[PDB]
Design an enzyme around this catalytic site. Structure first.
Site, PDB file in Angstrom:
ATOM      1  N   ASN B 190       0.817  -1.231   0.000  1.00 34.73           N
ATOM      2  CA  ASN B 190       0.000   0.000   0.000  1.00 34.73           C
ATOM      3  C   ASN B 190       0.850   1.280   0.000  1.00 34.73           C
ATOM      4  O   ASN B 190       0.320   2.363   0.235  1.00 34.73           O
ATOM      5  CB  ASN B 190      -0.984   0.015   1.186  1.00 34.73           C
ATOM      6  N   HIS B 192       3.099   2.279   2.103  1.00 30.23           N
ATOM      7  CA  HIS B 192       3.385   2.829   3.425  1.00 30.23           C
ATOM      8  C   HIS B 192       4.656   2.152   3.902  1.00 30.23           C
ATOM      9  O   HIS B 192       4.948   1.021   3.492  1.00 30.23           O
ATOM     10  CB  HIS B 192       2.256   2.512   4.411  1.00 30.23           C
ATOM     11  N   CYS B 227       5.980   7.390   9.281  1.00 28.62           N
ATOM     12  CA  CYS B 227       7.025   8.110   8.554  1.00 28.62           C
ATOM     13  C   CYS B 227       6.606   8.012   7.076  1.00 28.62           C
ATOM     14  O   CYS B 227       6.380   6.910   6.561  1.00 28.62           O
ATOM     15  CB  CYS B 227       8.413   7.502   8.787  1.00 28.62           C
TER      16      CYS B 227
END
Ligand SMILES: Cc1onc(-c2ccccc2)c1C(=O)O
Ligand SMILES: Cc1onc(-c2ccccc2)c1C(=O)O
EC number: 3.1.2.14
Lengths: 268, 269
Positions: B190, B192, B227
């Protein structure tokens, strides 16, 4: 995993893992490259080599000699999806006094079709001085009993992509990713940077829009010098054209070359 | 891999790979952490969940809700060697309206002995606004049929390390690793940053001499904020202590916004 009937090649099946896949839910080129390393190590173990170094013969260990990768060439037609089974066959072959070559064939386990292929050139080096050398009769006779005697090439076609000379990228680069550093996860069991990390570093300078709209079909990478644990790298890319790119990895400071390569990408 | 007889937990065996091991020829804590996430995903798939988000129920998908890790706690007694087989059993439990908990037990396949254990706290969040929320009856009733009803804890002990409050490290830090950035290999499906990358970033500020003469026994990590792909992180460590204990802090390189805080316990080899 297991050696084939003739004992001259090795096969292993892998189930693609959730963390090994990218945005398209298929294995990344770095996951594939990690699997080539794994099947390579298991092949060497199954034919008697003991885990200290990679395929270090008895004579090589006594003379403080190691096999080092000079070139890696990977071509992927289909990246396996998350949960799919991929079968990889690997074999090695003598290239006279120059060094050795290791080839791989990737297949879909359910269909039996070739989904990718790889070829790599390895040279002999002294572990301590880092000086290259030709392969002697003593070391050749030790590893030749593990290789097919007639040629067996993953990339047989004449004038193919795996044997083309790569030029040096000229400044200014079209794209760049600066200040790349290895972390502990990037180091192997001998505390050297894993050769797969350099592939990731090369790919870091490719623009995200190319990554989002294209699939990597071919990657050819030359290894000139190792990146130490406390070294910092700059990744440079220029489009040379499908989309083709010329790549250069160099030390962030003095600009000392560590790698040069090319990538070919197909529109999704 | 497969669900156990009662369908209330999942087991999977893994052969430790050449690239997954460190200097001692044993699996790193990041390899172990990757295996926990693989057995976790295969458990969710085996009980009907889709490959979109991790264990997102039917009601969650409609309301744009996801499970997010708030805390990860791992304790390793023996790291499996290269070529060894490790068996991991995982299960889930409801923690009322707070969220869910996922536990793991790691065993040596040849001896049957427990070589490690892990526990993790998960909270419900809206995918878009990032706002946390309590678990509704509708969501609970959907996932409760996949959980053991009586408590089953990987860390049963009365006063155990997995439930201790972690303080915020004060400047100046004893040690630091500055300018840490994620690359594409650090991103999940995804886009991330993979939760295992934060464990690696925490460990980056531990001095190499400690890493060389010690083995990591316990790691407790809190996840405060994500982050982004274009964010830069600073990793800070201070010794708090035969064993060595450390306090850790991950913060954004610029404004110093906290992303993680944690503790590690190490034992002399
Ligand atoms: C074994 C082995 O088999 N393939 C590789 C390799 C080399 C260069 C790039 C990617 C993988 C490799 C290694 O030692 O790194
Ligand atoms: C699934 C899954 O199972 N374990 C983890 C996890 C969470 C935090 C740290 C390490 C692993 C995880 C994830 O989605 O990241």
């Amino acid at each position: 995993g297991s050696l084939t009937e003739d004992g001259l090649s090795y096969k292993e099946k892998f189930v693609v893992r959730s963390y090994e896949v990218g945005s398209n839910k298929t294995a990344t080129v770095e996951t594939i490259a990690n699997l080539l390393q794994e099947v390579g190590c298991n092949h060497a173990q199954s034919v008697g080599f003991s885990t200290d170094g990679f395929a270090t013969t008895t004579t090589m260990r006594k003379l403080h000699l190691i096999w080092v990768t000079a070139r890696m060439h990977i071509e992927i037609y289909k990246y396996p999806a998350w949960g799919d089974v991929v079968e990889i066959e690997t074999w090695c072959q003598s290239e006279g006094r120059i060094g050795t070559r290791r080839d791989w064939i990737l297949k879909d386990s359910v269909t039996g079709e070739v989904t990718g292929r790889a070829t790599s050139k390895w040279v002999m080096m002294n572990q301590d001085t880092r000086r290259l050398q030709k392969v002697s009769d003593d070391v050749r006779d030790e590893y030749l009993v593990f290789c097919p005697q007639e040629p067996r090439l993953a990339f047989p076609e004449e004038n193919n992509r795996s044997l083309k000379k790569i030029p040096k990228l000229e400044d200014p680069a079209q794209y760049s990713m600066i200040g790349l550093k290895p972390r502990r996860a990037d180091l192997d069991m001998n505390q050297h940077v894993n050769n797969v990390t350099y592939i990731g570093w090369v790919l870091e300078s490719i623009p995200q829009e190319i990554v989002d709209t294209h699939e990597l079909q071919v990657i050819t990478l030359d290894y000139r010098r190792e990146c130490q644990q406390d070294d910092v790298v700059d990744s440079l890319t220029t489009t040379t054209s499908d989309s083709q790119f010329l790549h250069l990895l160099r030390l962030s400071g003095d600009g000392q070359e560590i790698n040069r390569g090319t990538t070919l990408w197909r529109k999704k």
